[PDB]
Design a protein around this ligand. Sequence first.
Ligand code: CLA
Ligand code: CLA
Ligand code: CLA
Ligand code: CLA
Ligand code: CLA
Ligand code: CLA
Ligand SMILES: CC1=CCCC(C)(C)[C@H]1/C=C/C(C)=C/C=C/C(C)=C/C=C/C=C(C)/C=C/C=C(C)/C=C/C1=C(C)CCCC1(C)C
Ligand SMILES: CCCCCCCCCCCCO[C@H]1O[C@H](CO)[C@@H](O[C@H]2O[C@H](CO)[C@@H](O)[C@H](O)[C@H]2O)[C@H](O)[C@H]1O
Ligand SMILES: CC1=C(C/C=C(\C)CCC[C@H](C)CCC[C@H](C)CCCC(C)C)C(=O)c2ccccc2C1=O
Ligand code: SF4
Lengths: 161, 30, 42, 33, 107, 60, 138, 80, 732
Amino acid sequence: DVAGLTPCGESKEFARRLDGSVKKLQTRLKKYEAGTPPALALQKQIDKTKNRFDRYGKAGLLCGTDGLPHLIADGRWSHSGEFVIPGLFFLYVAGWIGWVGRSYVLFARTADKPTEKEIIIDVPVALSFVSTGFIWPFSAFKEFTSGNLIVPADEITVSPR
Amino acid sequence: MISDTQIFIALILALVSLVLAIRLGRALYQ
Amino acid sequence: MDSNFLKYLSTAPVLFTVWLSFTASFIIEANRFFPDMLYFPM
Amino acid sequence: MTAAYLPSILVPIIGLIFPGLVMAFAFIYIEQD
Amino acid sequence: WLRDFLWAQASQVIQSYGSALSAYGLIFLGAHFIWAFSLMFLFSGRGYWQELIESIVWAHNKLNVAPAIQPRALSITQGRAVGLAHYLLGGIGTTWAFFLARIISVG
Amino acid sequence: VKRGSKVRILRKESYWYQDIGTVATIDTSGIRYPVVVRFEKVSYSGVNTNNFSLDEVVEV
Amino acid sequence: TLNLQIPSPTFEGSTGGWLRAAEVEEKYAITWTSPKEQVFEMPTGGAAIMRQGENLLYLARKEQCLALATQVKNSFKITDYKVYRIFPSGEVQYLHPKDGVFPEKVNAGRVGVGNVSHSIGKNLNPAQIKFTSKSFNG
Amino acid sequence: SHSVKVYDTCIGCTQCVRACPCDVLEMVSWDGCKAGQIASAPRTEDCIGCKRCETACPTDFLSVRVYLGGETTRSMGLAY
Amino acid sequence: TKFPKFSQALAQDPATRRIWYGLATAHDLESHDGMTEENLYQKIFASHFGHLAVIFLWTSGNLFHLAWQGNFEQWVLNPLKVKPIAHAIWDPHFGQPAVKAFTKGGVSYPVNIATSGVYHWWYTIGMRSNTDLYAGSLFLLFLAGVFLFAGWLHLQPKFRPGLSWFKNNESRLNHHLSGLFGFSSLAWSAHLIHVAIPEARGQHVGWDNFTKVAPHPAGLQPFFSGNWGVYAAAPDTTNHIFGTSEGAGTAILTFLGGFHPQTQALWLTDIAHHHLAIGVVFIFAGHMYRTNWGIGHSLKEILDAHRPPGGRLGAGHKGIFETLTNSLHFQLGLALASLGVITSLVAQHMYALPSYAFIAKDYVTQSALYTHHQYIAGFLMVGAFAHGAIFFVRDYDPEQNKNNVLARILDHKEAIISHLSWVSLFLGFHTLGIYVHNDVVVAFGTPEKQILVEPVFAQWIQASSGKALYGFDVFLSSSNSVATNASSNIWLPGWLEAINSGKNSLFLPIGPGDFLIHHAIALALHTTTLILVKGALDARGSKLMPDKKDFGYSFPCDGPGRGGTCDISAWDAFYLSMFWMLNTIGWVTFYWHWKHVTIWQGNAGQFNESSTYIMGWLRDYLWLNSSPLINGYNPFGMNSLSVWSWMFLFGHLIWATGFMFLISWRGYWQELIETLVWAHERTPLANLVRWKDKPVALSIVQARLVGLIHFTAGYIFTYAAFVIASTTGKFG
Ligand code: CLA
Ligand code: CLA
Ligand code: CLA
Ligand code: CLA
Ligand code: CLA
Ligand code: CLA
Ligand SMILES: CC1=CCCC(C)(C)[C@H]1/C=C/C(C)=C/C=C/C(C)=C/C=C/C=C(C)/C=C/C=C(C)/C=C/C1=C(C)CCCC1(C)C
Ligand SMILES: CCCCCCCCCCCCO[C@H]1O[C@H](CO)[C@@H](O[C@H]2O[C@H](CO)[C@@H](O)[C@H](O)[C@H]2O)[C@H](O)[C@H]1O
Ligand SMILES: CC1=C(C/C=C(\C)CCC[C@H](C)CCC[C@H](C)CCCC(C)C)C(=O)c2ccccc2C1=O
Ligand code: SF4
């Protein structure tokens, strides 16, 4: 398919990996009596291995000649869920964290002792801020366009050139 | 192969280069 | 509840430990109920 | 090896006499007023 | 010592992956990592890190997110102490994982 | 500038260059740097006040 | 003027005292007066007892003498100490306090050495003074 | 020897003179600051270069500056 | 004491610091007592002559030691079976079994087996006997003597050049581009056509017959006739046996592409046309600047005129002409950067497209050559940034560079350093996270959960060059593309045959391990650049030290005040970046050697499966390939690898010794030396003996440098012993 890789649900080396993992757990299972808690734990591990390999084989993942899933991250929509959509989820959460931290820093600057606000958090105000972060791209962009995000170069300290 | 005389000729050329190198080192040392 | 004890509970190391444990517990329970998520299913 | 005497002549000289004379003369040079 | 003790007896900790002793292989790698990480504190000095922190403070100042508690590089004594602590942790953890994996496998 | 005003620093070597301090006292005698400015951020040596000339100081 | 006959504090001796460079290059002397016999710490390591009256002591470095002076100033309230430099030829050079007044107090007749008439940020660039005997201060 | 300079940003607080272990600095009369005094370095041949004077200086960037130069027996702090 | 005669301050030092600092500042001519610009330039000119003579003497020594003690005439007959000899061994510390074990190469005396590849190079360029090797060694001795005499002569009065001659940019650029680059390349093309190709075709050409043995049967008549394509007709057959006339062609200038099927190296006719074309292009480049005849370009006018009118670059390149001409450190930084890029290019392109016959089958030689030139590249790039920092300290005049590109670099240095810091932290966080993720998930028995990103961008580039492995079907891997049809008559068959045969290192197949190791390389390059750029741009001053330019490029610290100022100088940034340079060349050479060792073994899947996690690197590359190296000597015997087995341990020792100078600092050692001084002065029968210089501890900067030197030497010797002994044990 892409880059000469084959889908994992028809790659024989993917099946060989699954068979080897199941056999490695089953030879451990052989030394325990049926009904013992180690036997149930090992059978649950076998079930989880089988379910994981089935799910990976039915997901459209591509496997190389090693027998393991290979991710495609060039932007194509047939593999957008391998990097692009996890990337969007991360970017949402990270922009949330950055926005609420910046908002708390700017609030703490207004306090009587800002450093005390840094080491002893005002928990209700911080919880208000972490609630505000769900609309962080629009809020941050409006903060940017109103001149409230970027400060001019003549108001930042710099070393002698 | 290489003879004794050829090695001696190379040694003489290397000695000439040694004298020239000593002169350059003295010139650079002012 | 004593306000001084609440103020101690609001200190940076305590809140840091509680928040990171809370986050870790989210990741652990998500991976317990939805394991082996190498990809976003689409 | 042609001129096989040359390693046994030159290797002790280059490895023991040359550094000894260089170290002695460099010592005299760097310590003299 | 290098071949018959270090090279020979480390075979158990580096082939522990996929077994019950794989935690020792992970701790082996992590302790090599922490030991190497210690050399950044041990070999360097405070002024470099303070000037790099000055540039990072400029970056946070550009977005008006500079903290009220001014970030400083670690003190010279703290640089030595942090480097020594991560060095001791890394080396002792490496020997810990190596010993435990080897002796559990062969003894 | 006067006592109590908020001023920006134009001394290049200063820790508080292009930062804002508050004027605490302007000396009237013939002092080379008569403007005492107090800053909310401490320097690397831990001080938070410094003397500047008039041309190193701009009112904001 | 250093009186060589001033008695010394009673000290049992140590390996931290002055080496051959004291008798070959230069040596330092510190004198002071105490109101009583009392134990002080030697700057070279060890405890000595200074006598009541005058005390003369010999050291290898000026910094050792000034460390002893600071110790007897801050622990015994002794401020009359004098520090001299002695050469192998016998020349004694009075060092501290240089004009009789301590350097942290302004004294008349002192002239400023090393004073620069501008701020430190007004120094010249090294490229300005390269291949040229101009100082970087201007 | 090391070179010690005193710039006219000095406020005459005498802290560098009190911090000097080698008696290099002293206070002289001046009119440029409110204290009426400025530091000076007449005895830089005794300067070891410890920069305790720079540590003592309270003016934003220092008024007293030590530039390490040619090393002598005194400047190296050698008791031998 | 008058050893440092160039420094009065150093000569009056009463301690052992005087000797060390006189040794360490001897070639820093700009800082010497009473140095003028004219004397500085003349001394530099003579020193450059001396370095040229050193290079020629070293090459003549290689040639002579091979012609005398090597087996070149035996190796020419059987190039793929005979081990090439570098030089003989005469070590009186050997025992008899070491004499037996080093007696290799078909000779009767102990020898070292050459790894430099000089055999393949000299055989490819037409040398066949020991006699012409000896003649080349004599010629290079004579050339070295000539350059020594020239260095002496151009310092004599009425031959010392003036500063106007030294700062003549246009004449030196024209002569060095047209003559030193162009005519040298044209003359090398002449040597290949006239000598190397006939000796490759079994015909002897020497000084005794080269005026009567035509390189081509038609002579220079097709060249003077304009029928140049006659020189491309009848190339070497794919049945050609190198160094013989069997299957030989008559062509001298081709564009065949690919490799000779027997030598597995580039066609010599392709190399001859390449160097001819390079010579023509460079001679055309060398007529560009105006020297004496009105025509030509002025460098100052070109620099001043290229200011973009939108004003984004400020004043543009105005003042850069004087800033570059007046600063030898600017020139040195530019030269070292360009050289470092090109020796990296040499390392990549020479393994990928070898030019010397039978050297692609010499695995030890390929590994040594790649590792050598890549470490040289790292050193050169670090030097470029270091001497750029020295330019900012010593030679940068801000008033002469108002609103310049240099001034605007200095004006947005904080943005530059902060974005470098961000990209380094970005790369390191996620690259280390993917590696640790793969390590943990493979250790827990589930390698199928690994994050394995296919490097599709570089695979797409390979397919654009014609690699049909990935099925991308674009550019040269598409049989209907205009790029395919454009080159189909000239070089496309040979290139496509070479790129799609898995018997060479031409565009080797890549997978997720390759992806991860290139992103680790990107991390290491960006981080070393961060340290070096931050050192260069903060060299003049920072918030912690706004007057740093008053203290020079190198100084220990500014004391414990202001929080503490350890390692604040730009020299210290060089010192910190040296470790990162060693780390990045280590990663690059580790990747190259492991990939090539697994490919040569026929076990490339071992690299493909083990390189995605760090334990695979530690176990399948370091631990697995250490076995013949650490068994060079053992309690049962010894063999020829024992020297590397020694050197390996040697490296592991001296590297560790470097740690002592980088962890323990001065005051401890000074107090120990004070106790030792007391002990010597108080010991009878030894206080009769007195030192002339007072013993002191090493200075702060000196100790940083000495620890760096021991560390770097241990790094280099350890890896060199490992790579040579491991490749020799597995394959040789
Ligand atoms: C309020 C949080 C906050 C925000 C918005 C930023 C913003 C920024 N930082 Mg910064 N930073 C922070 C905290 C923050 N920082 C802290 C606490 C540290 C110390 C570890 C650093 C250390 C740091 C370095 C060393 C670098 C940056 C860089 C950057 C820039 C690029 C983004 C980046 O690399 O992120 C990456 C950030 C980190 C790896 C550290 C973040 C640590 C935590 C996760 C964030 C703090 C969350 C906080 C607890 C929230 C509390 C709010 C609550 C009370 C309501 C950007 C200006 C880079 C730069 O200059 O780029 C131009 C750079 O090189 N920062
Ligand atoms: C390239 C330099 C070089 C050379 C040529 C040699 C040569 C030799 N070493 Mg060696 N060595 C060297 C470097 C070198 N070493 C270094 C760097 C070290 C430090 C690691 C050592 C440490 C070492 C040890 C510890 C020993 C040797 C020994 C030997 C001898 C081999 C055994 C034998 O048959 O001795 C038979 C010896 C003799 C017949 C006596 C020869 C006496 C000579 C000719 C007198 C020369 C006097 C002097 C150099 C005059 C010049 C002074 C002037 C420079 C100021 C041989 C002479 C062994 C030995 O026997 O030592 C004598 C021995 O025990 N070496
Ligand atoms: C045509 C006339 C000519 C020629 C040939 C040269 C040649 C040279 N000049 Mg020059 N020069 C000239 C005119 C000329 N000059 C004029 C007119 C002036 C006055 C304006 C000067 C002023 C001048 C100065 C002031 C200096 C020189 C220097 C040099 C030397 C540079 C170092 C060196 O060997 O690089 C050799 C470089 C090459 C052969 C090519 C460059 C290498 C690149 C990277 C390509 C190589 C790649 C290739 C694959 C390698 C294959 C080999 C491999 C297989 C082993 C070189 C010998 C310097 C020197 O050393 O003086 C002694 C020096 O300081 N020149
Ligand atoms: C980026 C590459 C570059 C650029 C932009 C330039 C640019 C320039 N070079 Mg340069 N040069 C270069 C590379 C470059 N060079 C290289 C690589 C080399 C050497 C190997 C040289 C060597 C070189 C020399 C030696 C000289 C230049 C000169 C010049 C300038 C002359 C401009 C010109 O030709 O006007 C000429 C104007 C025209 C051609 C206009 C055409 C006139 C009419 C309209 C003709 C058309 C009529 C009709 C429509 C067509 C039909 C005709 C039919 C009836 C017959 C110009 C600034 C010269 C100069 O002035 O130096 C500063 C000079 O002497 N160059
Ligand atoms: C293995 C050793 C190691 C490691 C990991 C680092 C890591 C780093 N160095 Mg570094 N360094 C080292 C050795 C090392 N160094 C040595 C030996 C030297 C020579 C003295 C240097 C010299 C040096 C300089 C001069 C510079 C760096 C910089 C950097 C940073 C950017 C590069 C990067 O990957 O960012 C990503 C960061 C990392 C990979 C660090 C690891 C982060 C961990 C894994 C996060 C998890 C933390 C964990 C949860 C904490 C739990 C602890 C708790 C349980 C107690 C980073 C912090 C540069 C910098 O600051 O750039 C901004 C810089 O300027 N270093
Ligand atoms: C700044 C970070 C950074 C850096 C320095 C590199 C550096 C490199 N990459 Mg890499 N890469 C990165 C990020 C980065 N990458 C990311 C985020 C991805 C997606 C997972 C990839 C995917 C990737 C592939 C598939 C390949 C490379 C390759 C390479 C090498 C060749 C150059 C190239 O293809 O550029 C590629 C880099 C870019 C096109 C952009 C990087 C810079 C941007 C700012 C990264 C930010 C992306 C952003 C966070 C995501 C947007 C949101 C999205 C979820 C919608 C080189 C070592 C090739 C290789 O291994 O050759 C041997 C190769 O085939 N890279
Ligand atoms: C700090 C210091 C202070 C002042 C002095 C100083 C020395 C100047 C400075 C240091 C500066 C430092 C030393 C700078 C060091 C710098 C680095 C090493 C320069 C590398 C440049 C790479 C170039 C742009 C070639 C890129 C290839 C591109 C064009 C190709 C495209 C295409 C080609 C044609 C062909 C096909 C491939 C594709 C991709 C299609
Ligand atoms: C005036 C306007 C047009 C000018 C065109 C000039 C073209 C270039 C002239 C080439 C140099 C002179 O060329 C003249 O002497 C050469 C001497 O080797 C001859 O060359 C001849 O001898 C060579 C050396 O043995 C052989 O390799 C040639 O095959 C043979 O042709 C040319 O046949 C002749 O034409
Ligand atoms: C890297 C390094 C630093 C930089 C180290 C920084 C200043 C300290 C970093 C401490 C962090 C902020 C605390 C814990 C980090 C966690 C991994 C993540 C951050 C958590 C935040 C909420 C604070 C020095 O200050 C230093 C000083 C002297 C010698 C060597 C060095 C040295 O090598
Ligand atoms: S560096 Fe030390 S000895 Fe020198 S003047 Fe300053 S405090 Fe005195």
